[PDB]
């Protein structure tokens, strides 16, 4: 037998609370989509040897380590995982957390265990700052996690904390039946030390900017999703993309390759709103005229301003498993 | 037969978005408690004449009008409602909405109808600004509604809007198993035109203040509730009570009678946090030392600084109905 697992990608709108005086830090607004997706089959390894196929080396080593640990934890068989459809690594799709939880849950099912995904996340050391991928793995839809309570020492040295349980979702909603335009831009994958050094230049952000981001997320995005108000939703997405303090810093860190696409989407009458997922290269867009947006993205792809584009829709469930032979 | 309905009071922490440039207006953070409570019995009026007992005149006239309308709407019998336990009127307990929805739903049950409470609210003209009482009637617990999308004209004349469907809850959580100390202060019930004139002096509030209130609510109160973090919860409640721009204006409008109690609660080591519900007179407090807080409130009541006090707990369900004879 095999356990077949499917999971959605995570698209992130913004991180919220990154100032040096707030009661809490982090917080992520995010949604789940069908494409790109993860599709993987977990079965007993014939030779009793853990085996991983169909991912980049970093994720494959990490899946092997996860399977060797869960094998010891649940006293299960050595597993092979064949990843038939991989989430693109370090592209703004939340691939590591989404894949570790999907495969872990699947191996869990193979072991006759039904794991808590927040616990599995903890066990595999995921969602230290973000609860987005962890929550969407469980629920799908649109979600905002409440990040982490800040300690009394926080105001003194905000840089030590900002950088064991993943934040639970303070908002979880079904995403309306609106199509999502995914835009794969030209974008570098960021340099670990270049990134840490970049983050320590931008953060802590002004307190007022944390507050405005909470306001745009909780009193902009989230009610628009809940009330299925397309115009309200797009107004909030654009306010985040084009005015969000931390988002602006992410766009500038990625540079012209992403900025040119966001400005093109804003300019285009076929694109009602557009966003950068994390630091990309994945951007995502909303349109009440997808026929027009298709034609717009096809020309950007021809010109070589983007590498690729596709329409997808929200996943309002999270991961799914089937037994197959 | 009779339908016996019980419903919790609504305690309000703060209104959120009351500036002249925000994507949305209003928004309420609130919770449901057992005491004060509503307890009412709805039966067929023997003489075929609508009858209301056990409330103040304003609410009684309004319940009669509601029963005469729902009678016509659902083609039901003339009802009598005996309100055995009334929510105190205009005291910060959300009595009108809570009572209209409880009695309407009960009469509904008498008519063999199961009404949508948001629709019933609309029908009876409730939750024009607040969704707090409407949502807590349905769910109980702790909730934050997302208020109302602001029109394009809003930025021009914010005063026209600020002042048909009630806002749905963007956050709904179970309240943890913490006791709530209710403090009934000396407080005037506000003058309709004194209030409208007061509101037009304070609102619109600065944009930065709207943003900080969203931040304290969504990235303060709500995650603390979700994670059952008492110290985090109290830190957020106090930040709202003592620094909330709009809350400060409500305290100053009510004056010394409420301000003296809030300052006493803040000063008291037995009171970890305290809040004013709307403009009161009801305040409410949290304590990890309720034995000490009991002794503190007993002395304030003896001295005559408060009229009354009681402990209660959260109601995590909303209204409940039973059939009785
Ligand atoms: N910069 C991040 C992250 C980081 O990605 C990593 C994976 O996250 P998940 O896939 O577990 O959700 C985390 O380390 C988080 O810091 N998330 N959202 C953002 C954002 O800017 O919106
Ligand atoms: N100033 C209000 C109101 C008003 O009370 C009335 C009843 O509300 P519900 O009982 O339907 O929730 C509404 O008209 C609202 O404007 N609510 N919360 C507040 C607050 O300051 O927190
Ligand atoms: Na556009
Ligand atoms: Na105190």
Author numbering:
A (entry chain AAA), B (entry chain AAA): 10 to 172, 180 to 341
What's the publication's text?
ForT catalyses C-C bond formation in formycin A biosynthesis, and we have previously determined its structure complexed to PRPP. Glu211 is essential for catalysis, and we suggest it acts as a general base to make APDA sufficiently nucleophilic.
The protein structure in the product complex is almost identical to that seen in the binary complex (RMSD of 0.41 Å over 319 overlapping Cα atoms). The loop at Ser174 is disordered here similar to the binary complex and in contrast with the T138V/APDA/MgPRPP ternary complex. The location of free pyrophosphate (consequently its interaction with the protein) is identical to the pyrophosphate portion of PRPP in the ternary complex. The Mg2+-binding site has been eliminated, however, because the CAPR ribose ring occupies a position intermediate between those seen in the ternary and binary complexes. As a result, the 2′-OH and 3′-OH groups hydrogen bond to the Thr138 side chain and a water molecule, respectively. The single carboxylate group of CAPR hydrogen bonds to the side chains of Ser21 and Gln266, in a similar manner to that seen for that cognate group in the T138V/APDA/MgPRPP ternary complex although the carboxylate atoms are shifted between 0.6 and 1.2 Å. The heterocyclic ring of CAPR is ‘flipped’ relative to the APDA and the extracyclic amine is within hydrogen bonding distance of a water molecule, but this water does not bridge to E211. The simplest explanation is this orientation is a feature of the L24A variant used to obtain the structure.
